[PDB]
Design an enzyme around this catalytic site. Structure first.
Site, PDB file in Angstrom:
ATOM      1  N   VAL A  27       0.818  -1.220   0.000  1.00 43.01           N
ATOM      2  CA  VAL A  27       0.000   0.000   0.000  1.00 43.01           C
ATOM      3  C   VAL A  27       0.852   1.271   0.000  1.00 43.01           C
ATOM      4  O   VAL A  27       0.337   2.363  -0.235  1.00 43.01           O
ATOM      5  CB  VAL A  27      -0.991   0.036   1.124  1.00 43.01           C
ATOM      6  CG1 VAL A  27      -2.067  -1.030   0.915  1.00 43.01           C
ATOM      7  CG2 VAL A  27      -0.290  -0.138   2.444  1.00 43.01           C
ATOM      8  N   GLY A  28       2.156   1.118   0.234  1.00 44.65           N
ATOM      9  CA  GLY A  28       3.101   2.176  -0.093  1.00 44.65           C
ATOM     10  C   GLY A  28       4.255   2.465   0.850  1.00 44.65           C
ATOM     11  O   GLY A  28       4.905   1.558   1.415  1.00 44.65           O
ATOM     12  N   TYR A  30      10.149   4.501   8.561  1.00 46.81           N
ATOM     13  CA  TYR A  30      11.052   3.457   8.001  1.00 46.81           C
ATOM     14  C   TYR A  30      10.771   2.843   6.640  1.00 46.81           C
ATOM     15  O   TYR A  30      11.328   3.294   5.645  1.00 46.81           O
ATOM     16  CB  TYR A  30      11.275   2.299   8.989  1.00 46.81           C
ATOM     17  CG  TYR A  30      12.590   2.459   9.686  1.00 46.81           C
ATOM     18  CD1 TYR A  30      13.719   2.833   8.960  1.00 46.81           C
ATOM     19  CD2 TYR A  30      12.704   2.274  11.057  1.00 46.81           C
ATOM     20  CE1 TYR A  30      14.906   3.016   9.573  1.00 46.81           C
ATOM     21  CE2 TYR A  30      13.895   2.440  11.681  1.00 46.81           C
ATOM     22  CZ  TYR A  30      14.986   2.825  10.934  1.00 46.81           C
ATOM     23  OH  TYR A  30      16.195   3.010  11.531  1.00 46.81           O
ATOM     24  N   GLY A  31       9.939   1.792   6.617  1.00 43.27           N
ATOM     25  CA  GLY A  31       9.877   0.857   5.484  1.00 43.27           C
ATOM     26  C   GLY A  31       8.671   0.801   4.554  1.00 43.27           C
ATOM     27  O   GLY A  31       8.288   1.771   3.859  1.00 43.27           O
ATOM     28  N   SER A  32       8.088  -0.382   4.495  1.00 43.32           N
ATOM     29  CA  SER A  32       7.120  -0.681   3.467  1.00 43.32           C
ATOM     30  C   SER A  32       5.967  -1.341   4.164  1.00 43.32           C
ATOM     31  O   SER A  32       6.142  -2.016   5.187  1.00 43.32           O
ATOM     32  CB  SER A  32       7.754  -1.592   2.451  1.00 43.32           C
ATOM     33  OG  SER A  32       8.966  -2.090   2.978  1.00 43.32           O
ATOM     34  N   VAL A  33       4.785  -1.113   3.627  1.00 38.32           N
ATOM     35  CA  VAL A  33       3.564  -1.467   4.281  1.00 38.32           C
ATOM     36  C   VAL A  33       2.776  -2.288   3.277  1.00 38.32           C
ATOM     37  O   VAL A  33       2.693  -1.950   2.102  1.00 38.32           O
ATOM     38  CB  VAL A  33       2.776  -0.180   4.736  1.00 38.32           C
ATOM     39  CG1 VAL A  33       1.566  -0.548   5.532  1.00 38.32           C
ATOM     40  CG2 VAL A  33       3.666   0.745   5.565  1.00 38.32           C
ATOM     41  N   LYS A  48       4.192  -3.523   8.642  1.00 34.06           N
ATOM     42  CA  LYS A  48       5.302  -2.699   8.232  1.00 34.06           C
ATOM     43  C   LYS A  48       6.602  -3.426   8.435  1.00 34.06           C
ATOM     44  O   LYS A  48       6.845  -4.008   9.473  1.00 34.06           O
ATOM     45  CB  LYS A  48       5.281  -1.338   8.944  1.00 34.06           C
ATOM     46  CG  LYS A  48       6.208  -0.308   8.305  1.00 34.06           C
ATOM     47  CD  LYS A  48       6.358   0.844   9.217  1.00 34.06           C
ATOM     48  CE  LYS A  48       7.176   1.993   8.638  1.00 34.06           C
ATOM     49  NZ  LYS A  48       7.009   3.211   9.555  1.00 34.06           N
ATOM     50  N   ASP A 163       2.362   8.363  14.411  1.00 31.58           N
ATOM     51  CA  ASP A 163       3.681   8.778  14.770  1.00 31.58           C
ATOM     52  C   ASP A 163       4.285   9.455  13.535  1.00 31.58           C
ATOM     53  O   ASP A 163       4.807  10.576  13.638  1.00 31.58           O
ATOM     54  CB  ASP A 163       4.498   7.530  15.179  1.00 31.58           C
ATOM     55  CG  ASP A 163       4.269   6.304  14.215  1.00 31.58           C
ATOM     56  OD1 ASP A 163       4.981   5.272  14.378  1.00 31.58           O
ATOM     57  OD2 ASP A 163       3.374   6.367  13.308  1.00 31.58           O
TER      58      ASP A 163
END
Ligand code: DF3
Ligand code: BOG
Ligand code: BOG
Length: 336
Positions: A27-28, A30-33, A48, A163
């Site tokens: 879905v897009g 730190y990292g990637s989801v 994540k 956050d």
């Protein structure tokens, strides 16, 4: 105890997750989801993958801090964790950290689509923000960058504070735009005011093109600093610059929010005062009559103080790494 994992490649990134979590989808940014389905609970979830978590001291420190923070945040209106896992079996193979939270799907822009909301809807949305803010503020945490992209909202307008997210300055306190280095929790209240104003009217309150233009828009509405606010400015240059300004009156808010609930207008006057010591707190706001249909004094919980000092130490890379690992081991799922 150890679940079975499976690997698979999504957007060029290898993901290694327990089997409970199926149908992973990116879905897009730190990292990637990825959204996913949690077959263990029946819940849709976002997952994540932290990006490069222990590659430098600073990556390590940030990982620890994100993990700590989220493990301590437990409130309907603040993002929290359903799970946290690593493929690794021991500290020696520990190089990835994955965070799981309830799928929300959308942020506040996605739900609003720059449109005017009804007064009831507006009350409900701001109420949750304040309820979440009351909680964060009680833990002696100031958010500092509250904006609609930092607010998760689902189809039923149930809202959570974030956050970090997935225009970036239109919601910022003027004291934050000017880099003061003492701040009140009420920097956050300022941001609530801008959000609320936008939801009542359909338009961005302070849509500056840049730093100074934004500060000019803000001064138009709430006037130049009066005498009480001036004696609280320590920087001598800042001080002289301000006095050098032609003084301007506060606008009356009834002229700015034509036909809004006069209770809506009243609260916004208490949020958007230039001097931060003079702004309503999140707890005072929740008691404001505007939220009569939603206010419950007995269901507006408060947090234990959150030790911010553990996260701002200067530790070696393996110290952070091992402390983050313990945090992964000690994790306990919320009651569900
Ligand atoms: O619904 C959610 C969970 S609430 C949310 C958090 N964020 C900040 C980015 N972080 C995560 O998504 C995240 C994931 C896992 C763990 C954590 C952790 F903070 F660590 F707890 C955070 C959002 C940004 C936009 C909208 C909602 C959210 N995500 C989500 C869902 C659908 C989407 C989407 C994201 O992107 C748009 C396409 O549809
Ligand atoms: C508290 C200290 C504030 C310092 C900001 C002063 C710098 C602003 O300089 C400003 O730049 C813009 C043109 O470039 C104009 O819109 C303003 O009229 C001009 O004064
Ligand atoms: C254009 C001039 C903008 C005035 C911004 C000051 C309003 C915020 O209010 C002030 O800000 C500080 C918080 O950072 C506190 O130290 C002060 O006590 C408080 O009065």
């Amino acid at each position: 105890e150890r679940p079975t994992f499976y690997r698979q490649e999504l957007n060029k990134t290898i993901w290694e997750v327990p089997e409970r979590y199926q149908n992973l989808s990116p879905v897009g940014s730190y990292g990637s989801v990825c959204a996913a389905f949690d077959t263990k609970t029946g819940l849709r979830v976002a997952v994540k993958k932290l990006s490069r978590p222990f590659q430098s001291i600073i990556h390590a420190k940030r990982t620890y801090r994100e993990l700590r923070l989220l493990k301590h945040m437990k409130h309907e209106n603040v993002i929290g964790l359903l799970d946290v896992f690593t493929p690794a079996r021991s500290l020696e193979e520990f190089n990835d950290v994955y965070l799981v939270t309830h799928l929300m799907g959308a942020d506040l822009n996605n739900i609003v689509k720059s449109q005017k909301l009804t007064d009831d809807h507006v009350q409900f949305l701001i109420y949750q923000i304040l309820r979440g803010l009351k909680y964060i503020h009680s833990a002696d945490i100031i958010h500092r960058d509250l904006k609609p992209s930092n607010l998760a909202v689902n189809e039923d307008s149930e809202l959570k504070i974030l956050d970090f997210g997935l225009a970036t300055r239109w919601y910022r306190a003027p004291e934050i735009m000017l880099n003061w280095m003492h701040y009140n929790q009420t920097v956050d209240i300022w941001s609530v005011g801008c959000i609320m104003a936008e939801l009542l009217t359909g338009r961005t309150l302070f849509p500056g093109t840049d730093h100074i233009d934004q500060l000019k828009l803000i001064l138009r509405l709430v006037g130049t600093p009066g005498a009480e606010l001036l004696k609280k400015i320590s920087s001598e240059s800042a001080r002289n610059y301000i006095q050098s300004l032609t003084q301007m009156p506060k606008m009356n808010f009834a002229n700015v929010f034509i036909g809004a609930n006069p209770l809506a207008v009243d609260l916004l006057e208490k949020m958007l005062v230039l001097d931060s010591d003079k702004r309503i707190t999140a707890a005072q706001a929740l008691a404001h009559a505007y939220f009569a249909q939603y206010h419950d004094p007995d269901d507006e919980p408060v947090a234990d103080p959150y030790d911010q000092s553990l996260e701002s130490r200067d530790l070696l890379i393996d110290e952070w790494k091992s402390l983050t690992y313990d945090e992964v081991i000690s994790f306990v799922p919320p009651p569900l």
